[PDB]
Amino acid sequence: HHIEVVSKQMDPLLPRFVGKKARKVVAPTENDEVVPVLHMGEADPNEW
Amino acid sequence: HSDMASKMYNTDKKAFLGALKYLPHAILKLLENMPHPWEQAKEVKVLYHTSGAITFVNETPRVIEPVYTAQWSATWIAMRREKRDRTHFKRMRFPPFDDDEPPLSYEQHIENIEPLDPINLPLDSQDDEYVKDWLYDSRPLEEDSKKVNGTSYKKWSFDLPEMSNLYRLSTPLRDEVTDKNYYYLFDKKSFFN
Amino acid sequence: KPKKKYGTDIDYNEDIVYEQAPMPGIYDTSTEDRQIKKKFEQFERKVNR
Amino acid sequence: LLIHRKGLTYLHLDYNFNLKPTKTLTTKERKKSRLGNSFHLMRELLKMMKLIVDTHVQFRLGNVDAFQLADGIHYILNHIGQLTGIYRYKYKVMHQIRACKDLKHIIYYKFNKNLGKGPGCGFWQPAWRVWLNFLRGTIPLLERYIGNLITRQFEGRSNEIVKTTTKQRLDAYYDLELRNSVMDDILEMMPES
Amino acid sequence: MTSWRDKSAKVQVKESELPSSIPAQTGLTFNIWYNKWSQGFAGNTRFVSPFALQPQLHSGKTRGDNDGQLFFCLFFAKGMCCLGPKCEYLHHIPDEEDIGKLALRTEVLDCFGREKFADYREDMGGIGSFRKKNKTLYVGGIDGALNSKHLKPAQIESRIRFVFSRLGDIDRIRYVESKNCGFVKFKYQANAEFAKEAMSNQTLLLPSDKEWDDRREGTGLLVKWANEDPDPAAQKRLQEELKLESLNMMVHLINNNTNSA
Amino acid sequence: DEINEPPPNICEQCLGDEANIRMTKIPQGSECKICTLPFTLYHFKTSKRSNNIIKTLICVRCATQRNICQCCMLDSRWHIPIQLRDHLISLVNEENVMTEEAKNDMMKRFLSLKNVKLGGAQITTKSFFLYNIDASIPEWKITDTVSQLLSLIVNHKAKCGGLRFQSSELGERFVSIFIIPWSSG
RNA sequence: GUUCGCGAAGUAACCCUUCGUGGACAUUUGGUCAAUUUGAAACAAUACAGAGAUGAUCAGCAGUUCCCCUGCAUAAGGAUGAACCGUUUUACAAAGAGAUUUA
RNA sequence: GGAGGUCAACAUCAAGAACUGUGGGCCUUUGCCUAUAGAACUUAUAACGAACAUGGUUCUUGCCUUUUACCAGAAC
RNA sequence: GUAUGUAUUUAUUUU
Ligand SMILES: [Mg+2]
Ligand SMILES: [Mg+2]
Ligand SMILES: [Mg+2]
Ligand SMILES: [Zn+2]
Ligand SMILES: [Zn+2]
Ligand SMILES: [Zn+2]
């Protein structure tokens, strides 16, 4: 249907960003894949 | 929009809070337009919101410097006189109105009352003849083809005999001291030092 | 249900609090879920009587 | 509208813009009801406009006279160190009062000279310039101050709200991160877990 | 046809008479921003309408019709609309065909041009929920007969049937004597909504009977959406309905699908 | 920025048939009806002369997961309600597939962000007493049938069709799952 | 409605008026928004009490939280703002001793 | 075509005592040297305004229970 | 002498 996208000039007194607000979210930490943690109790617990 | 209770104003209601940021501007743009002692009734250009949100007087006063020191020398003198003359001169009480008294709108009360004349001043038909014609106009010349530029009112262009008469009038209001050598330690630089 | 305090207050019973889809995986569970539902509908359906 | 939108219906602005509580206040309803150094500053500001333009409202009705007009709004611009009390909110503006006392005296003893002790007057210019400048000084500062106040009455205040170190709450910081920076080292001298 | 499709619709109330704004006296002072009253607490305000629509009497042809609007004037659905034939939003009972038009869009929004929310409301309140169709109305506070008990609950029945009957098509009306409610059910989500916004806050019987004079001080009958129905019967019935319906629409998906092959 | 950058997801039906169209872009529009967060709204009238202005009800994060036209709220591909499409796709296969969604508040807000899509998406008076009444068949169907061969009070509890009509002319022409009696006093 | 022009009729003597027609001039507003009960202010009143570190009476700063409130605020207050004060079992083994069962 | 507009948009306004274009020579585009043309506005008791305010950081003070709000000097 | 906190369901959701 084609298109042309024309922003709408405000009415400068009225809010700009009519829907903006200050809220709070917590967010999904989304991943598939893992980060293998890859490295390399007898005499020591004496010491420590 | 003075009466608002309805639903249909819940746009304009928000609109109002918006202009609350812009108001102080309007005050300034109102309060430098004061009609000044001599004018009777002043007419300005307001730019208004179309929600009834606020109304900015829109213009800025432009008055020629000498012509202006004239106009205020006139009123200055007429003052001193009209203080010396009359007997009990009663300063008015403040505030003008008590709090119970919502200010009465313009279209009804005030527009029929007619102005009750200002200062001006006697002047003359002999001394002041050049200047007596226009000197008290709201803005002295919105039009004089040759004398002033034109309606946009910038770059006034005058003539000796007039500018004389102005010199004459403004004599109360003028610095009067023509010898640079007068300010000796009163210049700036002796201040900064 | 005892009202709310802060306007966003959570009612924990209603929905999974923060639902982490456990993982992908190769082993294709997909059957064990039916043993689950059978046991869970079974349990709750018991308690009602 | 701003007020009734904070859900205070028990504060009343009369038509001179005094703010009075009409119902002696439950303490919580005081705390929710303290209002802003802005919104108070700006209340006062409007009060001044309405005061002057009142005196005009009178004159147009024909009730005073163009001389008592001039004296009146003179008296205003000088005694705003009484008629309003804007000096509670920005105290800086107490230069103008000092300034506008002084212009007062000058424009007298070059006026009184040889006539009268009385109230007669009517040179209000140099006041009017001073107050007009000082008003240009707070336009930006208001568009900011109240600009905030309104985005907070819509969008709710800021959710994060960090803060900074400061005079008082220093120690708790210094301590706090001291001990954290032991707990690294002592956590890493232990062999394992 | 000869009824609605024929003569132009009419005013009900003259804008003069239109109701008083500023809801009146729950409390001390009147808040300007919101429209409420300020302080104190008294029992909530609700009241019967002074008004109601008159299904075949006032409905008629209007402006949105000539120019082809969609949603139905709700201040007509209260018969309260003061604009007469001038009103853009349509005045009349939904036929089946208009629903023929809206039904494209009635997923999201009502017959009155309002945007259905998602979650219903604590009480099953006033505007729909797009996650679900519900055609079925709880009706409660039937005491908007005032308190005259009409010698049979089947006079309740005759009366609810008599009122809601007018608006259009109907499935069924199940009164409940155990607990006071009607539970009613219709064809078109359109019609459902329309009856709802119409019949809030009303009183009953003849152009007059008994306390008819004072009918105007009653509370008025709450009309709100209905939840599920716990019995087995109706429930199996439901999954049947859905079932046959999927059974139809598969034909669509094989038509466009099969064509796309 | 990126809010723009996933672009509108829009019906090819409800969008209307015309060749070229104009639609606004308003950067922070409504919140979703669903996730309850801001987004960019696109107005438009379908065609230019139209009476009503389409508005778009949801994110492009939210109308991704479900794959639904932000104005329509049908499926994109099948032109069908959620609670249908994932019902049909529940049928084939056998039992699965519903999307359990979001009461409370930041439950739904939170759950909006993760991109897993969702099950539907995953793939894509003369008293007349006439008895025998079938329970799930409505009045509309009954008096439907009557007006189709040519006013009512039914009781579905007792399966007893009670009935009245205006003139017994409709008595003859009525007669001239049905228990007949032409019953009046 | 203006203007240019044509034709016709009348007035006329190339015009004044009337009729018809051609041409030009002028070219798509507004809506995120319907008008009080059923798509959402918050206080107040009633009752129940009536201020952390302690044995007790107070100054206070912090810290965490999907709690915020007032304030222009990255200031400072809001009981040191409030909530915290609770419920608590498995990386689990090695050696020795007695009872039971069995190849 | 002329006059105007309390009309708009777009350029430009603090610097080697200061701008720009062009011809020619050299280096290798910059850059240097030479020749030439044109320069509105604003500048020497130095500047767009013979006018005159406010804010932030940083130090020095002054009121001095603490913070907003402040006292009076400087730098940015 | 007080801040502070708590509950304030009236209008019958299908067997
Ligand atoms: Mg604190
Ligand atoms: Mg304490
Ligand atoms: Mg604390
Ligand atoms: Zn209407
Ligand atoms: Zn669509
Ligand atoms: Zn969303």
* Domain containing residue E159: CATH number: 3.30.70.330
What is the structure's resolution, reported in angstroms to one decimal? 4.0
Give the domain range for residue F79: 4-124
CA distances in angstroms from A18 to A10, E68, E116, F40, F84, listed in the order given: 10, 31, 20, 11, 34
- Please give the Cα distance from B1 to E213 (Å, whole number): 38
CB F174: neighbour CB atoms within 10 A? 17
End-to-end CA distance of chain F: 80
- Please give the Cα distance from F76 to F68 (Å, whole number): 5
Is the separation of the CB atoms in E223 and E139 below 8 Å? yes
Determine which of C3, C5, C6, C18 to mutate to test the interface with F (most F C-beta atoms within 10 Å).
C18
Amino acid sitting at position D139:
I
Q: How was this structure determined?
A: cryo-EM
Strands F160-162, F153-155: pairing kind? antiparallel
Q: What is the dihedral of CA D80, D83, D87, D88, to 10 degrees?
A: 180
Contacts of residue B34, Cβ cutoff 8 Å, sequence gap at least 6 = B42, D52, D73, D128
Check whether the bond before E23 is cis (ω within 30° of 0).
Answer: no
Residue E140's DSSP bridge partners are: E222
Asked whether at least 3 C-beta pairs link F and A within 8 Å, the reply is: yes
Chain A residues with CB-CB distance to D156 below 8 A: 21-23
Phi and psi, residue E224, nearest 5° = -145, 165
Contacts of residue D96, Cβ cutoff 8 Å, sequence gap at least 6 = D130, D131, D134
- Planar angle of CA D139, D141, D143, nearest 5 degrees: 70
Could you tell me the two tokens for D15?
């038509």
- Planar angle of CA D15, D16, D20, nearest 5 degrees: 85
* Cβ separation B14–A15 shorter than 8 A: yes
D 105-164 residues, CB < 7 A, strand H: 129-130, 133-134, 136-138, 140-141
> For B190, what's the count of Cα atoms within 13 Å in the CB-facing half-sphere?
5
CB B160: neighbour CB atoms within 10 A? 8
* Cβ separation B22–A14 shorter than 8 A: no
Look-up of token digits 């009123």:
B75
Is the separation of the CB atoms in B17 and D5 below 8 Å? yes
Give the domain range for residue E209: 136-225
- Please give the Cα distance from A5 to A16 (Å, whole number): 19
* Cβ separation E108–F88 shorter than 8 A: no
- Please give the Cα distance from D47 to D44 (Å, whole number): 5
Q: What is the dihedral of CA B158, B164, B169, B174, to 10 degrees?
A: 90
A1-5 own/partner pairs: CB under 8 Å, 24+ apart: A1/F12, A1/F15, A1/F16, A1/F17, A1/F18, A1/F19, A1/F20, A1/F21, A2/F19, A2/F20, A2/F21, A3/F20, A3/F21, A3/F22, A3/F23, A4/F20, A4/F21, A4/F22, A4/F23, A5/F23, A5/F24, A5/F25, A5/F42
- Please give the Cα distance from F86 to F119 (Å, whole number): 7
| CA-based nearest residue in chain A for residue F14 | A1
E106 DSSP 8-state letter: T
CA distances in angstroms from B91 to D33, D48, D70, D83, E38, listed in the order given: 39, 18, 10, 15, 44
- Planar angle of CA D11, D16, D17, nearest 5 degrees: 35
Chain A residues with CB-CB distance to D143 below 8 A: none
Distance D172 CA to ligand 3 centre (A): 13
